[PDB]
Each structure stands twice: as structure tokens, then as C-alpha cells.
């Protein structure tokens, strides 16, 4: 059950290049995925959940549509970034890179969308909305449909093929700056080692990426998965009758419906990632 994050990436190295570029480490309530490149594209993904990006190896560029403007969010190696819900985004990946993306299982009410725009404008050229179960697998025919369309050929939209409006309001939020994960952890060392766990992004988002220093935690049975990643030093997770020693870079998925006890050593640093849909921000 313990997975050394870079050890898992090395074992699955061949996944992080075309044609598929990705491999899901975890794929139940919490989608923990690792993505490579090269992969340059003009399609913009839109969803009701949030997406956490972290660059393990090399840099990536997340193109976003923010408050009526095109913006390129450069995510450098070691940088973490949280995308709020319903922001159109188009990830650009390069050869020999590895990025972590965390997202969640959709609620049965939730729609995902894929859009192509007319050149450098906000006018929609082609769009498809769907109920997401396996994102990569569902996007492939949509993209193939686009590349075989009159819209791609002419660069002109077919009005009858566009929705009158999106199924939900698109985000009105300002996008944060990506930040160095190690720099933020080091700058907050006194609070972390004083037994106070800290939210990296705060209460204005659904997702909770929490940093933990020394101390003891107890996780109650939840209908959401929790992913733990020991960054520095070690800790012990007691779960399902077993004591699991997390060494530097070890990660552990706590499946929905499982309780656990967590004992973190002095000087140790770990993260937990939760994307609970009950915490979705009102529209
Ligand atoms: Fe996305």
C-alpha cells in the first residue's frame, strides 16, 4: 500500500510520453495522476471540481481563461498551483517532464466540457459537454471529432452546434500565482513543528492541501479518499490493523470508509490532499 512517489514514476516511466502521456496512481474518489509530454494543444477543459498541479520534473504551462483574458500560468519544477472550479484551462506539457494533477470523481449532476476557441478570441469554435467518468478516454473521440470537423477546416463555428449558454456559470475568480512548495514549507517551519497543521490554499477553495509537521492525527471514516505524502523525515500510519512506516517520499491513499491513526516525528513534513465534494463553493 505505501508507494514511493518517484519510485512509482520510475517504474511507470514509459507512461509519461505520447500517445497517452498519463497514468493514474489512484482512481477512486480522488484521482491522483501523473502526466508527461510533449503535449501541446488548443482545447480548454472545463469542470465543476478543482485541479491541483505540482511539477515533479520540469516545467509546464497552464493556459487559462481568466476574467475575460488569456493568461499563461507557468508552473516551474517544484511549484504547486490550485485551479478553482469552472475555469477553462489548456495544459501545455514538454518532453521528459512529470507533473502531478489531483482531481476528484464527479458528482452525477456535474458536467465537464471541452472547448476550442476561434483563434485568440473568446468566441467558441467547437464545444462538447459530457458526464465525466474516465476523462482521457472520453476526450480522445471529442478531439478526433474536432479535427475532422468543418469548424476545424474553416475556423468558423456552426451556430446550431453551440450551446445557448454553458450548463453552469464559468468562474469569475482571479487565478493565484504558482508557488514553490519547498519554499512555502521552509518559510512556515515554526508553525508546522509547533503542532499546527496548515492549509496551503485556505478556506476559499473546495480542495484542502494540508501540511503537517510533528504530532498525532486520527482520521475518521469519510466518504472521500485522502492522499498522504511524506516529504521529509518519517511518520507511522496505523490503518486496517497494520502499522505502515512512511519514509521520505512515501505516499499512502486512505480509501473512503477507512479510519487511521497518524504519528509524525520531530522535523518531519507531510501533506494530505482531500477534495470533498460537500465543500464545493456555491455558484
Ligand atoms: Fe482539467
Give the SSE layout.
Layout: E1 3-4, H1 5-11, E2 22-27, E3 30-35, E4 44-46, E5 51-57, E6 60-66, E7 69-75, E8 79-83, E9 89-92, E10 98-104, E11 112-117, E12 124-130, H2 135-147, H3 150-154, E13 179-180, H4 181-187, H5 189-193, E14 198-199, E15 208-212, E16 215-219, E17 226-232, E18 235-239, E19 242-246, E20 250-254, E21 260-264, E22 269-274
Antiparallel strand pairs: 1-20, 2-3, 3-10, 4-11, 5-8, 5-10, 6-7, 6-9, 8-13, 11-12, 14-15, 15-22, 16-21, 17-20, 17-22, 18-19, 18-21
The structure holds fe (iii) ion.
Keywords: Cytoplasm, Dioxygenase, Disease variant, Iron, Metal-binding, Oxidoreductase, Pyridine nucleotide biosynthesis
Binding site for substrate: 51, 93, 103
Cofactor: Fe(2+)
What can you tell me about this protein's structure?
This is 3-hydroxyanthranilate 3,4-dioxygenase. GO terms for molecular function: 3-hydroxyanthranilate 3,4-dioxygenase activity; electron transfer activity; ferrous iron binding. It is found in: Cytoplasm, Cytosol. Pfam families: 3-HAO. By secondary structure, the chain is mainly beta. The chain has a single domain, classed as Jelly Rolls (Sandwich), CATH 2.60.120.10. Helices cover 13% and strands 40% of the residues. It is built from 5 helices and 22 strands. The strands form 5 sheets. The protein has a 6-stranded antiparallel sheet. It has a 6-stranded antiparallel sheet with strand order 2-3-10-5-8-13. Strands 16-21-18-19 form a 4-stranded antiparallel sheet, with no helix packed on it. It is elongated and about 60 Å long. The two termini are 38 Å apart. Bound molecules: fe (iii) ion (FE). Fe (iii) ion (FE) binds next to loops.
